[PDB]
Amino acid sequence: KSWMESEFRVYSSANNCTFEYVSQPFLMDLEGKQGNFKNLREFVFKNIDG
């Protein structure tokens, strides 16, 4: 019993690159519980004046 990320199919390669940021490592559950929803994550993204 262990839920771990195995696949990451997003991008192929990059030649130029300008901004990189990696947070400190942590641990996450990744297990799929059964029942009703229990978490709500709200985000707002804006882009003004650069």
Partner: protein, 50 residues
């Protein structure tokens, strides 16, 4: 690194001790171009490439 394989590091998201390149003055050259060794050095930088 060797000159042909010039190694680049990106200095990102940290304040910088710009009071760190002549006080030792081990370096023969702290010859700065455009920015100069001044308060402008010890100021906001979008990206720092070493």
């Amino acid at each position: 690194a060797s000159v042909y394989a010039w190694n680049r590091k990106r200095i990102s998201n940290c304040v910088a001790d710009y009071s760190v390149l002549y006080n030792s003055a081990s370096f023969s050259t702290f010859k700065c171009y455009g920015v100069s060794p001044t308060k402008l050095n010890d100021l906001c930088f979008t990206n720092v490439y070493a």
